[PDB]
Symmetry: C2
Subunit: 229 residues, 2 copies
């Protein structure tokens, strides 16, 4: 079964996930209390256990690094791959180090404004925006988004669209290709699967490789973090 | 100086108080982050330290026992002794195990009501109420309190006063003895030194010997805890 001192913590409403190797002859237990992951460390004697955070000489919160790397990071990377595999429109260099996904709609003032705030990082080649168009805000939203997706170069047309603030003149299609209705439908299901009920819905990876999100127009702090700044 | 991993925690905004003996070859550091006391444990290797709570086989939160016993318990016992040394009126057996201090005023509905709630525990001989009269609620408050303190048996007169709801008939003194004005003045300074701006202000010791307080009319939970129940 479980060592007495750890069983005592378990009764404090904690559920153990696995055991792991702790430094200094200690045994570690990774667990959770509601949504919060926790680390427990059995002392050498075996009669005591500390519920807390382990730090090394450099000040790294090891407990935090392990929790994120085992409890949080996994699920997020799944949604990141699913986002990567979508038909997103590029903005910036295809090899920009920082990748930012954003669900945008043709009639979303905040989308245009975030597009604007993003200019510096994108022009620098540090950040690339990957836009997943959707049509969920206005009656004409789908017809417009599809008319954007259905052009000679959809990524450029989205740019010119955000830039001009929409005044762009282009041939609406007589038929919205099924391929384009699929992209819109896939993007909208993915947005829903992320519980994103606001556009723009932005997604980025933290320095510790965990999926982060942002809804609406980011304030300066959030903008700086999203931009990897 | 301080071991690297503990110095790392210290920089997280923690101030160390002293070092202590931890089990299993570990060294402990008692500290504080704002008002909260914290325990840090240097692992045997010396390269790591865990900021958290130590539990033994029986489930006792050792970290909590030490913090309260070294950070909280001291100051409270000081105010307890100062309260003990005051001229309080007895209610119940002088040898009742649980001691409860309460600052009361002659015109305080909530004082009368708490007096009422207290009946069961006091009659059982489990709890003794020690009342420190004050005169801070009404113009006639001091004159009344003093008239209570100035009687043949002040403790009984306070009882009969709470019981009868005040209708008690007794000889008001022509002169309020200086001794009685001193008690009222000492009680009022002590009440102030406790930041008690509400009457009744009740004070009791927790099972871990730390000073607890309660202002106004206690709800059922608080009443039960105050009564040691």
């Amino acid at each position: 079964e479980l060592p007495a001192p750890v069983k005592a913590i378990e009764k404090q409403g904690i559920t153990i996930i696995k055991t792991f190797d702790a430094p200094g002859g200690m045994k570690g237990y990774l667990g959770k209390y509601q949504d919060m992951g926790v680390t427990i460390y059995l002392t050498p004697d075996g009669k005591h256990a500390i519920s807390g955070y382990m730090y090394n000489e450099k000040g790294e919160n090891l407990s935090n690094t392990l929790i994120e790397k085992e409890i949080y990071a996994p699920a997020g990377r799944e949604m990141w791959q699913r986002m990567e595999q979508s038909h997103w429109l590029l903005d910036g260099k295809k090899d920009a180090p920082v990748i930012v996904y954003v669900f945008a709609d043709p009639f979303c003032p905040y989308c245009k404004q975030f597009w604007q705030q993003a200019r510096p990082w994108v022009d620098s080649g540090k950040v690339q925006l990957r836009t997943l168009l959707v049509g969920v805000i206005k009656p004409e939203s789908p017809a417009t988004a599809a008319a954007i997706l259905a052009s000679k170069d959809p990524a450029k047309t989205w740019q010119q669209y955000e830039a001009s603030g929409g005044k762009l003149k282009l041939n609406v299609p007589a038929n919205v290709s099924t391929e384009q209705m699929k992209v819109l439908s896939d993007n909208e299901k993915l947005m829903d699967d992320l519980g994103a009920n606001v556009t723009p819905a932005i997604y980025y990876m933290s320095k510790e490789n965990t999926l982060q999100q942002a809804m609406g127009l980011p304030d300066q702090k959030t903008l700086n973090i999203i931009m990897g700044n």
